[model samples]
Target: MPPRKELVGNKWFIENYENETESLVIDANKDESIFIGKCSQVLVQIKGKVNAISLSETESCSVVLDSSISGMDVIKSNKFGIQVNHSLPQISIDKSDGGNIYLSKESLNTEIYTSCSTAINVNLPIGEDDDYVEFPISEQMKHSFADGKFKSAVFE
Candidate 1:
């Protein structure tokens, strides 16, 4: 069994993706939500006012979101590309590896991050030529378990 999905109360559940050459696409609304799981090698574009989204239990895949409201929830995905075309208040990421987040011109503000994460880079659209500017989140962390305590900080 592969590529299963369902809809209820405008809630979407997509799982077990198999196709790679042919990507999937859907248009969503503010009242709706989306969930995708056990997927690989597929690119999905959920357009228009996506109020909720969950991208977990997947790898080697990509997702482009044009959510109108503040959006969140993506974990356990590695080496992934998830782009957001619309503005959001905050972005949440945890327990993952390698996320390349592309942001729109209006979405350049308010971002957050990680515990046990890796290779997180935020790219924003700017300039007359529309070249994306990259800001890589620091993976350099120093934790010491001595003096009955631990300390951590980002190296400058």
Candidate 2:
């Protein structure tokens, strides 16, 4: 079959495996298009502790940008999972204590990349309103922010 389409700003929930086995489970199906919000922001919230094998039962989340998307602006914090698994078409996450965000695999074109730690497993394609950094850099701009008088403003 042709490669699946990608997703962006969609939200996902948690799951609990009574068996307590080690494996990646996809509790929710994926969306067809890219989910970009007003600020290209995605949100995920985990409520309680989780349980699983190949995955952690604690709180965790992830987002996969389509090959169509070049970069992401992380706006919030929690734990984050970033994957670029091209073979898949939707986000596949194990058990979560609460709700979480996911990027559909159908649209992935790069490598699957997750956040550094579980302590901050949150949504990808973050916005400026959240904790992390946000930039409006164009895909073709080669100049550094330092070249302009307002370059310092970009950092602030």
Candidate 3:
């Protein structure tokens, strides 16, 4: 774990480097940011609201959220694995070489865009309506709204 600082756009940022398995816990309703350059394993837990989160790179990570998330970005470099437990409003995954993404069944009304070749698994909760929607990608990497989930798309 490193120092916590504020960026130019009133955003909070933190830098962390772990040798072995480490756990990072956040328990408050505030905007948080992170940049984990190198780590063997990382566990993240947030109990309150998060305005925005940016993960530059990770080897392996797991995030558990109890509240709402406004935005997030995960960039995978190598040997990456992530598990999320909240319905995020906006999420982006870039260059995901290989990994798995697990979303809780309670996640409703989520918009996620990914260009990685990772396996995404969304667990639908019991007694829930079919609200899952996914957009189709065009030849120019643009998205068009479609009434479905999980399709093939290439990001340029």
Candidate 4:
């Protein structure tokens, strides 16, 4: 699928675009999480104004939460992007703008692709062994906020 764009709280964002169009077909990489079928993939491309270059360069990020999460909140933030906590059903954000993607825990294993020259932060929930858990179901692993650099596609 091609990259799809969205406006979260008025900001322009993109995700799941490839699937919306035919010419924009994308492949799932190993690093990307694939929970169910192939069409569930999400791709985000973020672009926004560079107000300040605090201690970092371009700041862009994405997070995935288990479906069991009831909600989420921003733990903290500095010059870097913000941290988020996940609860059941809903996930909250530190800022309401930028290219962010929210997928159900069932979609964690699904593929995600991002291509923007910016620092992409990743927040993940800690849980029991994802391998042993059943598909489309929640695992016993503990969920926590994890951050990391964004890379190209990595198929499962």
Candidate 5:
């Protein structure tokens, strides 16, 4: 997604750029609130502090949170892939389908929950004692530890 030109304040903002493909940028410093109503292919970039993010429903979405972020209060991803370069205090995924979540390695203390199928990948940070876990996985799904430094959990 291209950089956002408009500045956002500490308030809620809704976006519905109904184009075949679109880009949404969130300035790292203007981290307050954001909502995605509908789109075909959307790219989201979180530069600074974002208090909340809500993705109602979309064909495909991609999100990237900068390394300096600490936490986001809320997250509702319908179908998307989210990547965070640093650890967060807490994040809640209300719903997800065919989505992937990536987190960096560190002390890595956080809470994440999602309904439906999704994949959570934790990339072990270099030279750090870090641990990761996921809740409420069915017996059918298996935890992936193919690579010692990289861990993944999938729920169907």
Candidate 6:
């Protein structure tokens, strides 16, 4: 828990914590909202099951989430990574550059979405504790417009 006083209204905001050696830590409640932005060169740890988490505009930083049932939204990030220790239902990213994600065994059924992003990969636990499989989010998109009354679009 981030010193109880720092979190008001069941929400915590971490921003502008750039170029620091120490990590950002938050022991959270299941329903709390967490937001992180403008951080660089540090690791972040969230130690409880969380309802919401949004991250933005970070560089050279990594994150660890003990549990995120609803998943996370990432925007405008660069060179970032995060590992989820429990189930995650969704992950959405927009306008980001270079991201890596690790998902737990329980999250194999989760969905991932991305738009205007590049260099994003996801790792899923394979078999047991010692192995993982990595997959890159596809960026190729093809749309067929004005095709005599039927419009079609596809992404790769």
> Which prediction has the highest lDDT against the true structure?
6
Residue-level error in angstroms, candidate 1, position 1:
4.7
TM-score of each: 0.85, 0.23, 0.59, 0.20, 0.58, 0.85
lDDT of 5 by residue, 76-128 (tens): 44456667765566555554555555666642555565545444343333433
- Candidate 1 matches the true fold with a TM-score of 0.85
Candidate 3, residues 34-145: lDDT per residue as tens digits? 4444444666665566666666666665556654556667676445544446666755677754444445555554566776535444433333453433323222344555
- Clashing pairs for predicted structure model 6, backbone only: none
lDDT against the true structure, per candidate, is 0.78, 0.29, 0.54, 0.28, 0.53, 0.81
* Clashing pairs in model 5, backbone N/Cα/C closer than 3 A: 28-47, 28-48, 31-49
How should the candidates be ordered by lDDT, best one leading? 6, 1, 3, 5, 2, 4
Query: Which runs in model 1 stand beyond 4 Å of their true positions?
Result: 127-129, 142-152
Tens digit of per-residue lDDT, candidate 1, span 13-105? 888996578768777888888888889888878888877788887888788888646576778888778788876666677788988888887
Estimate the lDDT of model 1: 0.78
Q: How accurate locally is residue 118 in candidate 3, as Cα lDDT from 0 to 100?
A: 57
Write down the TM-score for model 6: 0.85
In model 2, the Cα lDDT at residue 41 comes to: 25
Error of 5 at 7 (Å): 6.3
- Give the C-alpha miss distance for residue 10 in model 4, angstroms: 36
Candidate with more favorable, higher lDDT: 1 or 4: 1
lDDT of 6 by residue, 2-51 (tens): 32225778887877775777777889999897888877886879888998
Best of the two (2, 4) by lDDT:
2
Arranged by TM-score, best first = 6, 1, 3, 5, 2, 4
